[PDB]
């Protein structure tokens, strides 16, 4: 004799599509901070691309 047993199997497929902006996070909406951040270079482009 045989039995049929349904088995559940869970698999994550995706996570939340987050996004981070420097001048909002790195700078508290200031101006001099923006000057210094643009002085540091192109880290923010790399972060946004990633």
């Amino acid at each position: 004799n045989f039995t049929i047993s349904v088995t559940t199997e869970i698999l994550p497929v995706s996570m939340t599509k987050t996004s981070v902006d420097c001048t909002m996070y790195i700078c508290g909406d200031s101006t001099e901070c923006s000057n210094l951040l643009l002085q540091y270079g192109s880290f923010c482009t790399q972060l946004n691309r990633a």
């Binding site: 996004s19 902006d21 001048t23 909002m24 909406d29 946004n48």
Partner: protein, 50 residues
């Protein structure tokens, strides 16, 4: 689709809120007086509410 910047709304005006009193603090007697006690026993001038 590209993500370039953030929709930032600039502030309109500059509100300033300071207490409404007009008592001048006595800095003149503090900076220059007839006698100042020496280092072994120095005084405390508690400037408050001016």
């Amino acid at each position: 689709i590209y993500q370039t910047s953030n929709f930032r709304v600039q502030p309109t005006e500059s509100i300033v809120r300071f207490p409404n009193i007009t008592n001048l603090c006595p800095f003149g007697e503090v900076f220059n007086a007839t006698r100042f006690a020496s280092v072994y026993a120095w005084n405390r001038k508690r400037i408050s509410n001016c």
